[PDB]
Design an enzyme around this catalytic site. Structure first.
Site, PDB file in Angstrom:
ATOM      1  N   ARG A 330       0.835  -1.197   0.000  1.00 55.90           N
ATOM      2  CA  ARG A 330       0.000   0.000   0.000  1.00 55.90           C
ATOM      3  C   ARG A 330       0.869   1.246   0.000  1.00 55.90           C
ATOM      4  NH1 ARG A 330      -5.050   1.155   4.079  1.00 55.90           N
ATOM      5  NH2 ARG A 330      -3.386   1.165   5.657  1.00 55.90           N
ATOM      6  N   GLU A 421     -12.881   4.773   0.194  1.00 56.66           N
ATOM      7  CA  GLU A 421     -12.788   5.263   1.565  1.00 56.66           C
ATOM      8  C   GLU A 421     -12.879   6.782   1.646  1.00 56.66           C
ATOM      9  OE1 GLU A 421      -7.870   4.896   1.719  1.00 56.66           O
ATOM     10  OE2 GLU A 421      -9.140   4.055   3.288  1.00 56.66           O
ATOM     11  N   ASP A 449     -11.473   5.445   7.309  1.00 55.47           N
ATOM     12  CA  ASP A 449     -11.228   6.684   6.577  1.00 55.47           C
ATOM     13  C   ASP A 449     -12.534   7.257   6.057  1.00 55.47           C
ATOM     14  OD1 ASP A 449      -7.987   6.038   5.404  1.00 55.47           O
ATOM     15  OD2 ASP A 449      -8.672   7.886   6.362  1.00 55.47           O
ATOM     16  N   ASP A 620      -4.939   3.102  13.958  1.00 55.21           N
ATOM     17  CA  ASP A 620      -4.037   3.628  12.939  1.00 55.21           C
ATOM     18  C   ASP A 620      -4.514   5.025  12.581  1.00 55.21           C
ATOM     19  OD1 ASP A 620      -6.193   3.349  11.157  1.00 55.21           O
ATOM     20  OD2 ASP A 620      -4.899   2.606   9.549  1.00 55.21           O
TER      21      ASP A 620
HETATM   22  O1  LIG Z   1     -10.798   1.745   7.178  1.00 58.27           O
HETATM   23  C1  LIG Z   1      -9.878   2.182   6.555  1.00 58.27           C
HETATM   24  O2  LIG Z   1      -9.856   3.525   6.214  1.00 58.27           O
HETATM   25  C2  LIG Z   1      -8.530   1.490   6.556  1.00 58.27           C
HETATM   26  O3  LIG Z   1      -7.768   1.699   5.663  1.00 58.27           O
HETATM   27  C3  LIG Z   1      -8.108   0.790   7.846  1.00 58.27           C
HETATM   28  C4  LIG Z   1      -6.840   0.689   8.187  1.00 58.27           C
HETATM   29  O4  LIG Z   1      -5.839   0.997   7.270  1.00 58.27           O
HETATM   30  C5  LIG Z   1      -6.466   0.074   9.534  1.00 58.27           C
HETATM   31  C6  LIG Z   1      -7.279   0.307  10.679  1.00 58.27           C
HETATM   32  C7  LIG Z   1      -6.934  -0.252  11.925  1.00 58.27           C
HETATM   33  C8  LIG Z   1      -5.769  -1.049  12.016  1.00 58.27           C
HETATM   34  C9  LIG Z   1      -4.964  -1.270  10.870  1.00 58.27           C
HETATM   35 BR1  LIG Z   1      -3.371  -2.366  10.986  1.00 58.27          BR
HETATM   36  C10 LIG Z   1      -5.304  -0.717   9.618  1.00 58.27           C
HETATM   37 MG   LIG Z   2      -7.896   3.911   5.002  1.00 56.34          MG
END
Ligand SMILES: O=C(O)C(=O)CC(=O)c1cccc(Br)c1
Ligand SMILES: [Mg+2]
Ligand SMILES: [Mg+2]
Ligand SMILES: [Mg+2]
Length: 712
Positions: A330, A421, A449, A620
């Site tokens: 990513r 997102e 997001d 995150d």
């Molecule tokens: O939901 C989204 O916007 C994501 O893209 C989630 C995300 O990167 C994430 C969320 C919690 C823990 C981890 Br490891 C990655």
């Molecule tokens: Mg995201």
């Protein structure tokens, strides 16, 4: 200086050396040509990159102003929709079409199963994730709350047989449900043999075969007393390990030692929201890990990448299965710049452009033998996050095309996993998919997001519902369904993944196993897990749900309207008591502080942070985007005062200090002497002014501030 001149660019020496000495050799790309390419691509695409960012701001300004001039309580949906269309936010939906992406691996086009996301800057974790393609079900059951720690079944410092037996029985039921015997239950098996190419399961008073003999995939050891038996269901492998001489095997009626599940089918090596990388040194640590993963020589004893697995076919021939998760990377999105490279004016270069060039370069190693091949079909799989609308997808297409030319790769080698997102992508999704019709390998609802964007976009509309309420609001449920509809209508079945989001409650595995089954039931061919353990448990769901059949049944359906997508999550009049407001504030402040303190002081971009109810959450940047935007919204509309926010931050801070303890620097009691504390405050108090509520500008600035102080 500590920089290398190439055309208009001045490249940090550490990055320059890394690419030359480590990344380029073996790719057959001439170094001079590469670097000239970097300069050229940066020069050519920067203006458009900037124009796209300016357009976001302009759209957001118009929307802010639309709400402010309104005052009429219930938003007039037809007026609002017409407005969004007028300003170019809501674009016409293209005619039906089918994606044409080719050269994609089976793990993406066909196999339904878990997708693991891991911070690329942590070599240990990245290695475990790559190896998480296979995982112990016994370890996943015994080690987590999926088997309740009731009286007598507690985890102790040593093996608890009562608990172990529950694990064994849980797995036996799983086998019964997934690969049923013609008669009887795996619970009663005493042995396994292979005869005339058929699996024979001994029961107490008889023997039986599989109800579907085609689910017998192979075995290891002697047919007459194998060391393991390999089964397949819904395209995923299950392996029963047989060893009566083992700790668990000795207690088992068939001598079974474990049941191994094919678990993390694919893994996303993350340079974005789960990592903190704010300069050339940080980017190089990440790139070097990504390089070691692609060359197969990453090593953290010494933890290494697993080899492929050898089996005997039913008939007696030999074959192998992938021992590693198929890797995506990513890249960061269109927003940020990074001083790892600056131009002659001292202006930082766009980071997403650099990631495309550098992670794409490095990915070439994964297309060739490791002294083994990520993509045998010849693709490079890049997740592109945080795009807003089809022009931004088109830009990513052109960026990858230009990078392919610099790297001497065939066109369309670099594939795109599209994050859905951001709101302007959601409502233009079909067009976004179209803009990448020959590159797209997935769409995925990055719901966290997406929730942040939802709040920021309608910031001026009024106060939003609580964070916990968001997960069940109309807009998000319609967004989830709309994503699946669009992918299926574009022909994703059998061609590209339809994916859903992350389970963040890392210790609530019983709950995950109970709840997350909703994702493949909704037709998602993959969904995100935070760990190899959660990958193994989530795999259970794909054995229970026939995702392919679910997708087939959903064909032609349109289950979400534009009006539903646009339903703003405004809180009703007088929705909360003083105590509920206080809880929401403390909950958000604790989560923000817990995450931010480790981001700014230690450069950790993903951390488990106990919420207000003491539930552990993998935080995150996206979860931080939500928390900070929510409080910003509440402050904007007078739900809470600036003193409420200050007191809460000041309250939660010592608790977070307590939750930590060697490279840790306490925020309290000298709050305003802590860069991390000030960062947290700034994220809230400037929340409304951050573009689309993005947290990186503040996090990067404050992390760099911390590093500079630490260097003097
Ligand atoms: O939901 C989204 O916007 C994501 O893209 C989630 C995300 O990167 C994430 C969320 C919690 C823990 C981890 Br490891 C990655
Ligand atoms: Mg995201
Ligand atoms: Mg304004
Ligand atoms: Mg079935």
């Amino acid at each position: 200086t500590d920089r290398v001149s190439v055309g208009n660019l001045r490249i940090a020496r550490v990055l320059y050396d890394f690419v030359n000495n480590e990344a380029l050799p073996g790719t057959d790309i001439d170094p001079d040509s590469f670097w000239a390419g970097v300069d050229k691509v940066v020069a050519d695409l920067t203006p458009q990159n900037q124009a796209l960012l300016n357009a976001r701001d302009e759209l957001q300004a118009q929307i802010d102003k639309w709400h402010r001039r309104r005052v009429i309580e219930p938003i007039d949906m037809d007026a609002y929709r017409q407005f969004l269309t007028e300003i170019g936010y809501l674009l016409p939906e293209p005619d039906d079409f089918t994606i044409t992406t080719s050269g994609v691996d089976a793990e993406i086009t066909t196999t339904a199963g878990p997708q693991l996301v891991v911070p690329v800057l942590n070599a240990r974790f990245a290695l475990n994730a790559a190896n998480a393609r296979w995982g112990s079900l016994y370890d996943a059951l015994y080690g987590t709350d999926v088997i309740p720690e009731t009286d007598g079944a507690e985890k102790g410092p040593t093996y608890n047989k009562v608990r172990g037996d529950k694990v064994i029985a849980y797995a036996r039921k799983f086998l019964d449900d997934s690969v049923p015997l013609s008669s009887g239950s795996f619970g009663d098996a005493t042995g396994f043999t292979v005869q005339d190419g058929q699996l024979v399961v001994a029961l107490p008073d008889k023997s039986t075969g599989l109800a579907n003999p085609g689910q017998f995939a192979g075995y290891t050891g002697a047919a007459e007393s194998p060391t393991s038996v390999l089964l397949i269901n819904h395209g995923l492998h299950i392996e029963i390990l047989i060893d009566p001489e083992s700790q668990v095997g000795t207690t088992d009626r068939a001598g079974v030692k474990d049941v191994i599940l094919e678990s993390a089918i694919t893994t996303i090596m993350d340079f974005e929201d789960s990592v903190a990388a704010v300069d050339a040194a940080d980017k190089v640590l990440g790139y070097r890990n990504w390089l070691g993963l692609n060359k197969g020589d990453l090593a953290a004893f010494l933890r290494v990448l697993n080899r492929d697995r050898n089996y005997t076919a039913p008939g007696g021939g030999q074959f192998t299965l992938p021992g590693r998760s198929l890797m995506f990377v990513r890249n960061v999105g269109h927003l940020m710049t990074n001083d790892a490279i600056v131009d002659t004016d001292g202006s930082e270069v766009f980071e997403g452009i650099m990631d495309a060039l550098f992670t794409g370069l490095i990915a070439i190693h994964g297309l060739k033998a490791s002294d083994l091949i990520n993509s045998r079909t010849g693709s490079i799989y890049i997740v592109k996050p945080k795009m807003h609308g089809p022009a931004e997808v088109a830009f990513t297409c052109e960026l990858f095309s230009r990078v392919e030319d610099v790297l001497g790769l065939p066109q369309n080698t670099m594939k795109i996993g599209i994050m859905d997102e951001e709101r302007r992508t959601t409502v233009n999704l079909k067009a976004c998919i179209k803009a990448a019709a020959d590159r797209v390998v997935f769409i995925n609802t990055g719901f966290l997001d997406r929730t942040g964007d939802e709040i920021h976009t309608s910031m001026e509309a009024g106060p939003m519902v609580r964070k916990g309420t968001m997960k069940s609001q109309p807009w998000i449920l319609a967004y989830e369904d709309h994503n699946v509809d669009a992918g299926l209508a574009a022909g994703f079945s059998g061609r590209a993944q339809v994916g859903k989001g992350m389970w963040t409650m890392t210790e609530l595995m019983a709950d995950m196993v109970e709840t997350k089954i909703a994702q493949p039931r909704a037709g998602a061919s993959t969904a995100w897990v935070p760990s190899p353990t959660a990958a193994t448990l989530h795999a259970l769901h794909y054995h229970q749900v026939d995702v392919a059949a679910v997708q087939q049944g959903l064909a032609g359906k349109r289950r979400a309207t534009i009006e539903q997508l646009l339903t703003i999550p405004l809180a009703k009049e007088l929705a909360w008591a003083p105590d509920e407001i206080r809880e929401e504030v403390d909950n958000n402040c604790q989560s923000i502080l817990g995450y931010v303190v480790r981001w700014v002081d230690q450069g950790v971009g993903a951390s488990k942070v106990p919420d207000i109810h003491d539930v552990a959450l993998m935080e995150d940047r996206a979860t931080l985007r939500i928390s900070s935007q929510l409080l910003a919204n509440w402050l904007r509309h007078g739900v809470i005062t600036s003193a409420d926010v200050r007191a809460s931050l000041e309250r939660m801070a010592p608790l977070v200090d307590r939750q930590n303890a060697v490279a840790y620097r306490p925020m309290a009691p000298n709050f305003d002497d802590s860069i991390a504390f000030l960062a947290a405050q700034e994220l809230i108090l400037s929340g409304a002014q951050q573009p689309n509520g993005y947290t990186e500008p503040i996090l990067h600035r404050r992390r760099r501030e911390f590093k500079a102080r630490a260097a003097e």
